[PDB]
Design a protein around this ligand. Structure first.
Ligand SMILES: Nc1ncnc2c1ncn2[C@@H]1O[C@H](COP(=O)(O)OP(=O)(O)OC[C@H]2O[C@H](O)[C@H](O)[C@@H]2O)[C@@H](O)[C@H]1O
Length: 194
């Protein structure tokens, strides 16, 4: 899997991990996608997940849009709303579901309102995984890429959502960072917050 675990701690009944690698290789029953509002997986982690699941990113975009329409009766999601799709080709590595979430557009800015939207984008998939009886879930750094939220602020917000979460089914939560320099930043956040 070419995955490195950098930090592990108990946060309630949840075992929380910080890992460095590709989220499409992480051993979790559900992986979270940092999607856009329309689930058009043309770039970033959304493209990576879409290409890994369906073999073609455009194909997974069609499957994701159909799932959004059936679950919400709309062609877009808001912060906190979560679309569930089958992980298809990723089922061979233990990943059964993709939980699509949408974070805010920071563009290098930070505020209480941007924090609330991101907090909802992290808590929503935890609550959806809980509702489904999913025991393990992996997250990317939602809004830290194209949406331009400061990585340190993204990791602090992710930790708030994990700490506030209440559940009986979710036992393992992981934050998966692709870049090694970015993983080091996330590590320092975990160390002073836990
Ligand atoms: N395979 C990977 N595994 C783990 N993390 C990854 C991977 N590839 C990238 N990342 C990291 O994943 C993090 C999130 O970066 P982004 O995927 O851009 O997500 P967003 O929430 O900012 O933008 C969402 C969409 O909205 C926009 O309008 C675009 O349409 C976007 O597709 C970064 O730190 C990446 O380095």
């Amino acid at each position: 899997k070419h995955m490195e675990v950098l930090f592990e701690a108990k946060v309630g009944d949840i075992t929380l991990r910080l890992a460095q690698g590709d989220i499409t290789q992480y051993p979790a029953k559900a992986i979270v996608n940092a999607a856009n509002e329309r689930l058009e997986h043309g770039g970033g982690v959304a493209y990576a997940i879409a290409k890994a699941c369906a073999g073609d990113a455009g194909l997974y975009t069609e499957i994701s849009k159909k799932a959004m329409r059936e679950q919400f009766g709309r062609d877009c999601i808001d912060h906190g709303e979560v679309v569930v799709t089958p992980a298809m080709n990723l089922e061979e590595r233990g990943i059964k579901y993709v939980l699509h979430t949408v974070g805010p557009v920071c563009g290098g800015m930070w505020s209480g309102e941007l924090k609330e939207k991101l907090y909802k984008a992290f808590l929503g998939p935890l609550e959806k995984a809980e509702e489904m009886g999913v025991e393990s879930i992996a997250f990317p750094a939602v809004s830290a890429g194209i949406r331009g939220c400061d990585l340190e602020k993204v990791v602090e917000t992710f930790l708030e959502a994990v700490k506030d979460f209440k559940g009986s089914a979710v036992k393992e939560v992981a934050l998966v960072i692709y870049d090694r320099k970015s993983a080091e930043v996330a590590l320092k956040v975990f160390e002073r917050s836990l």
